[PDB]
Amino acid sequence: YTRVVWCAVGPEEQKKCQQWSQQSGQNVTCATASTTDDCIVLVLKGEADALNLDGGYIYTAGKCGLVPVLAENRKSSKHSSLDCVLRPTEGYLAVAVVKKANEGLTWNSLKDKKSCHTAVDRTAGWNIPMGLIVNQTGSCAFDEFFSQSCAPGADPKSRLCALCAGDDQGLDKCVPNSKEKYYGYTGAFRCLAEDVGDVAFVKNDTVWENTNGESTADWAKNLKREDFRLLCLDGTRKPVTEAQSCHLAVAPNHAVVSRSDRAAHVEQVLLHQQALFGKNGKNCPDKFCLFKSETKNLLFNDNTECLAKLGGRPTYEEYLGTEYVTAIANLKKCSLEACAF
Ligand SMILES: *[C@@H]1O[C@H](CO)[C@@H](O[C@@H]2O[C@H](CO)[C@@H](O)[C@H](O)[C@H]2NC(C)=O)[C@H](O)[C@H]1NC(C)=O
Ligand SMILES: C[C@@H](C(=O)O)c1cccc(Oc2ccccc2)c1
Ligand SMILES: *[C@@H]1O[C@H](CO)[C@@H](O)[C@H](O)[C@H]1NC(C)=O
Ligand SMILES: [Fe+3]
Ligand SMILES: [Zn+2]
Ligand SMILES: [Zn+2]
């Protein structure tokens, strides 16, 4: 009676989830929805139990009363004896990436350029960079700052969707799931790499995992790191090896959320599922790896080492930290105490 219904966002997640479901002997089964917001609503209703969320999505979910359960944890430096599940999480570095060739474009000349964003309301792709730009300009006209963008989840006929490409057929332009060619970390970095946009708002790790052979994927196999630079907030440009000193912010790790009344069942099952299909897991790479999806980042980021227990049974505000929570409150002025649903 601890069976968990995962929420898959879009059909490729759904496909991975079904393979997970089948491989788990139905300890995990799958609900599917078209956007993250719809998946949150399913969980609210009790029609799904859980999914992994970006930080901006944890905020929306948390005002609706959902709670973080386990955090994604990637490759670590200090405290590396301590086992992944126990090891605290550090956050990731939100960066703004450009082409080297595009000379002279800096954090200080982004007005009227072309922008690539993971999705609207995501941490590295939107909350951080738009939060900065509104604050930098005293202006809530964030939809008027770039000339065109791919910002999945924005109005498809607005300039915020003009660069979005939609699916293999050109359908679903600007939908916030992986059918949108330029959706997500890997999508927004693609948007930049094919020179559709002038800047992509992603995290530090995306640049590395999609260059210098780390990706075999079609558009990525020939990408070279030296061809990109990070935009720092002092107006300078740096190599993508300097993310530590040229980032826009540090982001709270993506975390599994659930209904509070289900949080404990979800926690146990996921710990158990990870021992079966995570990094060194009994059945990965043999039958199934929870943490791989050929760089599509389906249901978990592909760089995820393990899902880690959280210290202090945190609220969602505590999980996100009080800096990030205000920044998001401030930004949402352009648009306090209400669940959105
Ligand atoms: C930014 O991201 C890259 C890619 O994740 C980091 O480099 C990896 O880090 C671990 C140790 O932290 C190495 O052992 C991996 O092999 C690296 N991956 C690759 C593909 O080279 C880098 O450390 C991160 N930088 C900062 C400043 O956070
Ligand atoms: C308020 C709304 C708008 O466009 O006017 C908006 C702004 C930014 C992000 C959004 O995405 C969500 C999603 C769920 C709840 C609230 C906002 C929704
Ligand atoms: C924007 O301005 C407010 C007011 O100073 C500040 O609290 C917030 O952290 C700023 N947001 C970002 C994303 O830097
Ligand atoms: Fe994120
Ligand atoms: Zn910093
Ligand atoms: Zn607390």
Binding site members: 54, 92, 118, 122, 124-125, 185, 254
Per the annotation, binding residues for hydrogencarbonate are 118, 122, 124-125
188 contacts 116 by C-beta, under 8 angstroms: yes
Q: Is 204 in the pocket of ligand 1 (CB under 6 A)?
A: yes
Give the other-Cβ count within 10 Å of 29's Cβ.
17
Does 251 contact ligand 1 (Cβ within 6 A)? no
Counted residue by residue, the chain has a size of 341
Among 330, 333, 334, say which to mutate for ligand 3: greatest number of ligand atoms within 8 Å of CB: 330
Residue 244 near ligand 1, beta carbon < 6 Å: yes
Residues whose CB falls within 8 Å of the CB of residue 4, separated by 6 or more in sequence, listed in order: 27, 28, 29, 49, 50, 265, 266, 269, 270
Distance of CA 330 to the CA centre of its chain: 21
| Cβ pair 58, 319 in contact under 8 A | yes
Which residues have CB less than 5 Å away from ligand 6 (the ion)? Answer: 318
Residue nearest to atom 15 of ligand 2 (CA): 340
- E strands, the chain, are 4-9, 28-33, 50-53, 66-73, 92-99, 114-117, 148-150, 199-203, 228-231, 237-238, 249-251, 255-259, 306-308
> Which residue numbers in the chain precede an interruption (C–N > 2.5 Å)?
335
CATH node for 74-254+317-327: 3.40.190.10
Give the Cα separation of 266 and 113 in Å (integer).
44
Cβ–Cβ under 8 Å, residues 30 and 22: no
Nearest CA to ligand 1 atom 18: 208
Write out the binding residues for Fe(3+): 54, 92, 185, 254
- Taking the alpha carbons at both ends of the chain, their separation in whole angstroms is 29
* Rounded distance between C-alpha atoms, residue 215 and residue 294, angstroms: 8
Nearest by Cα to 178 from 332, 17, 12: 12
CA distance 221 to 83: 33
Instruction: Give, using CA atoms, the residue closest to atom 5 of ligand 3.
Output: 135
Spell 307-326 as b/e; 16+ CB within 10 A means b: bbbbeeeeebeebbbeebbe
Q: How far is the CA of 71 from the centre of ligand 5 (A)?
A: 20
Ligand at shortest distance from the CA of 130 = 3
Torsion of CA 15, 19, 25, 27, to 10 degrees: -50
**Cα gap 24→185, rounded to integer Å:** 28
Q: Are 273 and 78 in contact (CB under 8 A)?
A: no
> Cα dihedral sign for 177, 118, 164, 339?
positive
Q: Which of 41, 54, 130, 335, when mutated, tests ligand 2's pocket best, judged by the most ligand atoms within 8 Å of its CB?
A: 335
Resolution (A): 2.1
Which of 250, 286, 306 lies closest to 85, judged by CA? 306
- Cα–Cα distance measured from residue 289 to residue 278, given in angstroms and rounded to the nearest whole number: 6
104, burial (CB in 10 Å: exposed 0-12, middle 13-18, buried 19+): exposed
* Short-list 26, 184, 57, CA closest to 17: 26
Nearest-ligand number for the alpha carbon of 132: 3
- Which atom of ligand 1 is least distant from the CA of 247? 27
Count of helices and strands (H, E) across the chain? 9, 13
SS3 251: strand
Pick the CATH number of 2-73+255-316 from 3.40.50.1220, 3.40.50.1400, 3.30.1490.20, 3.40.190.10: 3.40.190.10
Q: Is 53 left (phi over 0), alpha (psi -120 to 50) or beta?
A: beta
Method: X-ray
Which residue intervals of the chain bear CATH 3.40.190.10?
Answer: 2-73+255-316, 74-254+317-327
**What are the phi and psi torsion angles at 47 (to 5°)?**
-85, -20
CA dihedral 202→208→213→215, nearest 10 degrees, is -40
**Euclidean distance between CA atoms 125 and 120, whole angstroms:** 7
Residue 271 CA to ligand 1 center (angstroms) comes to 25
